[PDB]
Write a protein that binds this ligand. Structure first.
Ligand SMILES: [Zn+2]
Length: 260
């Protein structure tokens, strides 16, 4: 039901729903947006992004995606807007990329749909424990930045350069002195909705902040993301693409967008 295609089991995993008792509730997908099904929220205090002090450490490929870890022993990469439930520091981020240039980003706004997206994960520091944040509806906060193909993104070059060295899962690479400022789009608009299974356990600990301004990346850049593998080294070649699940009906998604 409601699953003609699912990332995992071809027509949607049944065992998943029966393995997680919490399936008693309603949530599968992180978000699903419609211009009509989205409610604007007042010009409350914007999201203060302070990651000029962000210190990247390492980049790692773990089968389903490739993550770059930042240090948060101090308030290096900080994100907090007005009324919220904590300060969410940046710990890592990864990119989404669909096999076809007209899919992959997810978070489809009525008719939207992009080939790629940048997903930055922030963790609520006031509980001093990432797993504790996972056990909280507001425990995490993530930034979703759509990627559109066209003009090249000079700031993206850094990660594109190292993609070939993180091709297969299991291997790691040093990735220090990275600045996320080079990833900034033009307009800073966003949607804000708590997301589901965007985490190991089937729960809604994530707060999705999806930017309405997609960044411009070039074909040469996006093509190199398609060079990554799900497999490890010395394993049957598979291309790290899509890695996303179809969006869900009003059966537990209603969108809000807090901006002037
Ligand atoms: Zn993601």
């Amino acid at each position: 039901m409601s699953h003609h295609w699912g990332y995992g089991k071809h027509n949607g995993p049944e065992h998943w729903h029966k393995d997680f008792p919490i399936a008693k509730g309603e949530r599968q997908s992180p978000v699903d947006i419609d211009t009509h099904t989205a409610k604007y929220d007042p010009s409350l205090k914007p999201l203060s992004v302070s990651y000029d002090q962000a210190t990247s450490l390492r980049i790692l490929n773990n089968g389903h995606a490739f993550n770059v870890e930042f240090d948060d022993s101090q308030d290096k990469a900080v994100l907090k807007g007005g009324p919220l439930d904590g300060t969410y520091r940046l710990i890592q981020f990864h990119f989404h990329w669909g096999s076809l240039d007209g899919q992959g980003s997810e978070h489809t706004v009525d008719k939207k749909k992009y080939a790629a997206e940048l997903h930055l994960v922030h963790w609520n520091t006031k509980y001093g424990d990432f797993g504790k944040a996972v056990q909280q509806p507001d425990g995490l906060a993530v930034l979703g930045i759509f990627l559109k193909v066209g003009s090249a993104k000079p700031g993206l070059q850094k990660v594109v350069d190292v993609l070939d060295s993180i091709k297969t899962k299991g291997k790691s690479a040093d990735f220090t002195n990275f600045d996320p400022r080079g990833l900034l789009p033009e307009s800073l608009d966003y949607w804000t909705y708590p997301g589901s299974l965007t985490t190991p356990p089937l729960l809604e600990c994530v707060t999705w902040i999806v930017l309405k301004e997609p960044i411009s990346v070039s074909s040469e850049q996006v093509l190199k993301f398609r060079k990554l593998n799900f497999n490890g080294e010395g394993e049957p070649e598979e291309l790290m693409v899509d890695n996303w699940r179809p969006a869900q009906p009003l059966k537990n998604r209603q969108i809000k967008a807090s901006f002037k």
